[PDB]
Amino acid sequence: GIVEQCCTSICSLYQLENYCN
Amino acid sequence: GIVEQCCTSICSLYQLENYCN
Amino acid sequence: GIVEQCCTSICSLYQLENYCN
Amino acid sequence: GIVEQCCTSICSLYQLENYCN
Amino acid sequence: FVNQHLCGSHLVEALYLVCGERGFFYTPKT
Amino acid sequence: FVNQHLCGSHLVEALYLVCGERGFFYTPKT
Amino acid sequence: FVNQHLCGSHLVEALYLVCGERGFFYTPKT
Amino acid sequence: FVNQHLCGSHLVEALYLVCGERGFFYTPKT
Numbered sequence: 001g002i003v004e005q006c007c008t009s010i011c012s013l014y015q016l017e018n019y020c021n
Numbered sequence: 022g023i024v025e026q027c028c029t030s031i032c033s034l035y036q037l038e039n040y041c042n
Numbered sequence: 043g044i045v046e047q048c049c050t051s052i053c054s055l056y057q058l059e060n061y062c063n
Numbered sequence: 064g065i066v067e068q069c070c071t072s073i074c075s076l077y078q079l080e081n082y083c084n
Numbered sequence: 085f086v087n088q089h090l091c092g093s094h095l096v097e098a099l100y101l102v103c104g105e106r107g108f109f110y111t112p113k114t
Numbered sequence: 115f116v117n118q119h120l121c122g123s124h125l126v127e128a129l130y131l132v133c134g135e136r137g138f139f140y141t142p143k144t
Numbered sequence: 145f146v147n148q149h150l151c152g153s154h155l156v157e158a159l160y161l162v163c164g165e166r167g168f169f170y171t172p173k174t
Numbered sequence: 175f176v177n178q179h180l181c182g183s184h185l186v187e188a189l190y191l192v193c194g195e196r197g198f199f200y201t202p203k204t
């Protein structure tokens with residue numbers, strides 16, 4: 001879910017901006 | 022109150038010129 | 043008064059609570 | 064709500080449990 | 085003889101500690 | 115103004131330097 | 145931006161420079 | 175005063191491991 005998107009593969013500052021309240 | 026503004030961040034004379042009578 | 047006694051005379055940290063916030 | 068105590072004070076691997084996900 | 089201006093900056097010491105979390109009031113006028 | 119992150123005797127005492135003979139209230143409470 | 149696999153502790157420290165004064169959470173489960 | 179901006183990192187540092195499978199829930203506002 002949260003990690004596979006950023007950890008397995010790469011993740012971007014915006015793709016990551018959804019992981020904030 | 023005042024702390025968030027002035028101790029956690031810098032407060033200028035007129036920013037606390039509101040804190041008195 | 044507050045400016046009368048604590049100044050010509052010293053005050054004890056207990057009575058100090060008389061004039062607290 | 065912990066960030067104001069666990070800063071100047073000490074909490075480790077047993078007291079912070081209170082605020083973990 | 086009576087310097088409130090100093091009493092005020094010294095007392096202001098004892099005001100904050102005793103009332104550091106409850107805070108305090110002052111009016112230099114008075 | 116001396117622009118700084120003030121706390122302790124670094125703060126409330128400074129008010130009486132600028133806040134005048136009116137008075138002030140101290141809210142340590144965030 | 146820096147983009148790589150992001151796992152372990154190294155990531156939990158990322159939302160700290162990117163998330164701001166708002167807030168956050170952490171889910172270790174992939 | 176104490177800097178949580180710095181202080182917290184060590185902490186925001188610690189929330190991850192000690193938390194494990196659960197992860198954490200932070201709020202940089204209170």
Ligand SMILES: [Cl-]
Pocket residue numbers: 090094
């Ligand atoms: Cl003096």
Ligand SMILES: [Cl-]
Pocket residue numbers: none
């Ligand atoms: Cl590694």
Ligand SMILES: [Cl-]
Pocket residue numbers: 175
């Ligand atoms: Cl200091």
Ligand SMILES: [Cl-]
Pocket residue numbers: 180181
């Ligand atoms: Cl530090």
Ligand code: NA
Pocket residue numbers: 123
């Ligand atoms: Na002093």
Ligand code: NA
Pocket residue numbers: none
């Ligand atoms: Na590190």
Ligand SMILES: [Zn+2]
Pocket residue numbers: 093094
């Ligand atoms: Zn003096």
Ligand SMILES: [Zn+2]
Pocket residue numbers: 122124
């Ligand atoms: Zn100091």
Ligand SMILES: [Zn+2]
Pocket residue numbers: 152154
């Ligand atoms: Zn590593």
Ligand SMILES: [Zn+2]
Pocket residue numbers: 180181184
């Ligand atoms: Zn540090």
